[PDB]
Design a protein around this motif. Sequence first.
Motif, PDB file in Angstrom:
ATOM      1  N   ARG A  86       0.819  -1.216   0.000  1.00 43.61           N
ATOM      2  CA  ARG A  86       0.000   0.000   0.000  1.00 43.61           C
ATOM      3  C   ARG A  86       0.852   1.264   0.000  1.00 43.61           C
ATOM      4  NH1 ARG A  86      -5.521  -1.000   3.678  1.00 43.61           N
ATOM      5  NH2 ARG A  86      -6.209  -2.808   2.436  1.00 43.61           N
ATOM      6  N   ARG A  88       4.011   1.406  -0.995  1.00 43.90           N
ATOM      7  CA  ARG A  88       4.787   1.444  -2.239  1.00 43.90           C
ATOM      8  C   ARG A  88       3.942   1.873  -3.447  1.00 43.90           C
ATOM      9  NH1 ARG A  88       7.711  -0.398  -5.218  1.00 43.90           N
ATOM     10  NH2 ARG A  88       6.481  -0.468  -7.149  1.00 43.90           N
ATOM     11  N   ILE A  89       2.621   1.729  -3.339  1.00 45.41           N
ATOM     12  CA  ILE A  89       1.711   2.329  -4.322  1.00 45.41           C
ATOM     13  C   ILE A  89       1.514   3.831  -4.053  1.00 45.41           C
ATOM     14  CG2 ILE A  89      -0.527   1.789  -3.226  1.00 45.41           C
ATOM     15  CD1 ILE A  89      -1.669   1.238  -5.968  1.00 45.41           C
ATOM     16  N   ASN A  90       1.574   4.228  -2.780  1.00 46.68           N
ATOM     17  CA  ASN A  90       1.469   5.639  -2.417  1.00 46.68           C
ATOM     18  C   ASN A  90       2.518   6.473  -3.150  1.00 46.68           C
ATOM     19  OD1 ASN A  90      -0.794   5.534  -0.655  1.00 46.68           O
ATOM     20  ND2 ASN A  90       0.512   4.976   1.088  1.00 46.68           N
ATOM     21  N   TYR A  92       4.323   5.629  -5.455  1.00 46.93           N
ATOM     22  CA  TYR A  92       4.447   5.142  -6.838  1.00 46.93           C
ATOM     23  C   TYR A  92       4.134   6.188  -7.909  1.00 46.93           C
ATOM     24  CZ  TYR A  92       4.239   2.020 -10.885  1.00 46.93           C
ATOM     25  OH  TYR A  92       4.458   1.415 -12.102  1.00 46.93           O
ATOM     26  N   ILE A  93       3.282   7.154  -7.576  1.00 51.33           N
ATOM     27  CA  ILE A  93       2.983   8.259  -8.491  1.00 51.33           C
ATOM     28  C   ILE A  93       3.676   9.549  -8.048  1.00 51.33           C
ATOM     29  CG2 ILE A  93       1.173   9.542  -9.704  1.00 51.33           C
ATOM     30  CD1 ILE A  93       1.225   6.448 -10.199  1.00 51.33           C
ATOM     31  N   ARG A  94       3.850   9.694  -6.735  1.00 52.77           N
ATOM     32  CA  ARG A  94       4.528  10.845  -6.143  1.00 52.77           C
ATOM     33  C   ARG A  94       5.876  11.095  -6.809  1.00 52.77           C
ATOM     34  NH1 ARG A  94       0.490  12.124  -2.357  1.00 52.77           N
ATOM     35  NH2 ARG A  94       0.974  10.263  -1.109  1.00 52.77           N
TER      36      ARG A  94
END
Lengths: 94, 95
Positions: A86, A88-90, A92-94
């Motif tokens: 979760r 690492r998805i956070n 992931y766009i940042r």
Amino acid sequence: MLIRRLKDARLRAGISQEKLGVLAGIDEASASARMNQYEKGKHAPDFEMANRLAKVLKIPVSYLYTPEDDLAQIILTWNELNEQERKRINFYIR
Amino acid sequence: MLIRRLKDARLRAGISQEKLGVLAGIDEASASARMNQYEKGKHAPDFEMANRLAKVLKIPVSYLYTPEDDLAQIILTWNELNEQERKRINFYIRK
DNA sequence: ACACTAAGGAAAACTTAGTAA
DNA sequence: TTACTAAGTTTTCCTTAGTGT
């Protein structure tokens, strides 16, 4: 609330309209009628009730309110991720 | 519907309660009262109305029904991503 | 069994009216 | 201006009772 999402998730949980209602706190003599109106679009559960339904259906409640199939699948997938995945998805766009 | 999501999005859009209601097709004489009730949790709008609010607020509607702050943030970000970048996340959200 | 529905009574929303901040 | 509320009507939901699938 989107009836496609209620239905799909209910089917995936493999339970009847009535048993869904019963597990979510509705009296046995109203469960079947109420869940069917919800699922056929005749009436809308309030937000408290959709939270109970979602808990019963093991989904994030906002899935029931997401029209975009893609965003809906992201929510669904995010539901089974761990804090590791979760986070690492956070970023992931940042 | 979550009152804090409505409020935060309305303030990020920089409009008042009444103006948001009017842009969502509520008569101007009902708008202020009606939007205020929504944002204070006195009453809950129907989903058809919630969709009209989101459109005004330039958000995905399910944001207003997301209790999890980290999921809600994910939703907003996805919101701003263009078509091409959506492929990238989708590919990663799989298997 | 399970899905589905009209009809009424019950519950919650909408409109109005008006008061603060 | 903008935010907010009490009241009474309107609207919607919840319950019943029961048919169809």
